[model samples]
Target: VNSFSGYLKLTDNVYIKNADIVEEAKKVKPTVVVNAANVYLKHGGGVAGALNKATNNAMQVESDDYIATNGPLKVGGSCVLSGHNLAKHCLHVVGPNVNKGEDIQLLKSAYENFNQHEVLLAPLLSAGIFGADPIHSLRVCVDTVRTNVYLAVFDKNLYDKLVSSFL
Candidate 1:
């Protein structure tokens, strides 16, 4: 078993690439495993497991109504054009083109509720590709919002990987 560590926040499911989920599920014996409609990952692989592993809770996103054009009625396809699968029960953020300032806009709307004492839950937001502005979207969200920001990071290596190449 190979184990690496990093931290960032992903309120969605934890999709382990190429992981033997059936075996993993056996090893990680969870109460109930729910697989999303989209993506080739374990039902328990999205933000649900991530939060549970990182924070010990079964949290759901606020925007669970943004239905998909073609996909599971619940999970839907990856972020509109983002190409990333919609995490089960997590906020489905559809950002604009990369670093085009749309990400900030989308983020502002997502977090404004949280800033207003509303709980904002989401998966880790990262770059579409390597060398892209991974943190730009988040930077905009934090800079624009004026609330007591509280976020716990899981998947730090993804952030580190972004950092290593962001600047």
Candidate 2:
């Protein structure tokens, strides 16, 4: 379930097949769950929408309010808020959008933003909502991560692939 790459380590808890991310986040007990959002904090689709529903729309409302005052978030920029359902804090990250080429720098920035947390459960940024390649996303997640990070993969195939690579 866990492996070390130098002093930092990554733990894979890939058995939660077809599991709700909100539920998974709670079980993992992460300090923060990174919510993948667009520049405008749009949670109308994909994992963002799920997190919105799970938190009783708290994430959407707070994110909208934050974006309204701050304007559109730059790629890699993020806003943090309290979680209504699971985890203590939710970190909403502005990731790459559809039809855009992979922005590894932006992804790295997003991951680095949460480096302060001791335990974090993060989805594959750009891969879920933005449709980026899962393998590429995994690489990016591994590259910039610090802390003890747990990857939340719902797809059985992707989960298998990730666990195999890490193990």
Candidate 3:
């Protein structure tokens, strides 16, 4: 499957573009693919659902295994697990909800927590049900991520908006 075209360069190391991230994960084999996850590690909907389906639901099996073995991942915390055919690992990140104060610190921590990885493939975290503005979320991501990152946007509309909003 096809992946990225030339992206809107946010920095020398950060880029954003229209992509089928699942496809990119298959081809690029980034060090980690970020899961927009719940604290319980349930791979429910959104990017989480796409990943669950991509990995043949083995990712959720590992998510359950992680929760049972280590307890719920704290709201601002994250963990790594086998990507099961996607990437080297999946980094599950839980961001804040608007009703829950929209704490930028918590959301920022999800990106800041892991710094050693060289490449990361992620979407706009918390821009859906968790209820943060996409641009705000993208800002946090661009402001915090420490390594090369490709932030994927599935919809051409949102891709256009992101390109407009930031550039």
Candidate 4:
């Protein structure tokens, strides 16, 4: 797949970007590909769905084991899985359904909790099907992430819009 890579910092520390999510994941080889999933770790929708399909559903099987022991993860919580084919590992953050106007704080919480990793690959939480505004959602991610963070994007139009607007 065609992909482009560049770096932009909204602040001295807030790292962000727009490009092929999976392709970048390969280059960075992040410790984890942080994806938003429900407590059940269901991987059938949004970014999670794309990952599940791309990784040959290996993430789903790995995540299921974690959920079985830990029970359902609460919103704003997270779990990690050994990377199957897509990333070195898969980090699943339990995100709120923005349609219900769930607290954005949870989104920040997920980012904050995972900030210790050396490199993190994350989608814009609560955007897309979750219906949260793209810019606002990205702001939360940028503001909260304390480590190297990559904001993965799929659409070229959306990528250009964000780059020109924020970069």
Candidate 5:
């Protein structure tokens, strides 16, 4: 049901995996979508933590990925953490150090939000936030959202794709 390339492709029909929602969505092709907003914190936290706190337990993905949690938590209204330096919508999967439950919920909310939108941008999957395993951690997040999400890395290829899709 999950793949390494961040893309879910089925032959005849789209397989929505185990979740009841995704499975149903496959039959419907969907009408509404929800997306997680990107937020980067200068001295706060966001999805970047997963990629930033990389030492020994880091996932074997593309490093040099500009991963890390640094930002400006004071926007205008509530004190939502910033995604990063130039992130359009850095989602707050977790706060500060690492809270799996809260992080998962934020990610879930993002998926739902994306479902409500017409088009989505590059949605980076924050698999390991608190030194958690990437495959398992990411799978849990992915299932919670139960929708097609994007992985926003500091890569030109992904950035360009997101711009085209969203903008």
Candidate 6:
């Protein structure tokens, strides 16, 4: 059925899976979830919005507080926020917009700009509304991310696309 179940290993430490990112991150205790964020630092779009909704708006509130205190999160910048529910913490990355070009490097920096967690559950940053394809995001994750990464995608077509491109 190609239900997009299970995980595909890209490296010994990196994997891609078709699943709900939050639930999977929770299942893997100690895994910090990554939020594909904007420069405004608002958790209001796509994965970020869903995460905030799931967290009972705690994520949005904290992100607003963070912006008020720390100013705007520049593109490629990152910061940690409180992870409500079962998540211990959430890492927010301000990824680049694809139309701007040279987007992969910014995404690489976003993933790199962290406290270096061993286990990270990330989605395809810069893809979807940002205009980049899932494969490009996957490529950046495989090539630049150093942690034990679990790349999650909610769409079956995206899962199949990544599978066709690199597995």
Off by over 4 Å in 5: 1-88, 95-129, 152-167
Winner by lDDT between candidate 6 and candidate 5:
6
lDDT (0-100) at residue 72 of candidate 2?
84
Q: For residues 1-167, what per-residue lDDT tens digits would candidate 4 score against the true structure?
A: 11325756566555556666666776766667888787788888888888787778888888888878889888888877776777778888876778877887777776675676766778877777777777777777767777766677777787677767773
**Winning candidate number (lDDT):** 3
* lDDT tens readout by residue for model 1, 27-139: 34322222212232122334334433332232222112233233332212233211112222233333333444333344344433333322322332333321124466446
* Per-residue lDDT over 25-110 for candidate 5, one digit per residue giving the tens place of the 0 to 100 score: 22333332111212332211233333233212222121222234334221111122222222222232322123333343343333
Indicate the residue-level lDDT of 21 in model 4: 63
> What order do you get sorting by TM-score, best first?
3, 6, 4, 2, 1, 5
Pairs that clash in candidate 2: none
**Candidate 1 global lDDT:** 0.32
* Residue 15 shift from truth in candidate 5, angstroms: 12
- Model 4 scores a C-alpha lDDT of 0.73
For every candidate, C-alpha RMSD to the true structure in Å: 11.5, 4.8, 2.7, 3.4, 14.0, 4.0
Total residue pair clashes for candidate 5: 34
**lDDT-superior candidate, 4 or 6:** 6
- TM-score, cand. 2 vs. native: 0.80
Q: Tell me the tens digit of each residue's lDDT in model 2 across 78-121.
A: 87777667777888887666466646557778767767776667
Model 3: which ten-residue window has the lowest total lDDT? Answer: 1-10
- The segments of candidate 1 whose C-alpha lies over 4 angstroms from its true place after superposition are 1-45, 52-104, 118-133, 161-167
Better of 3 and 6 by TM-score: 3
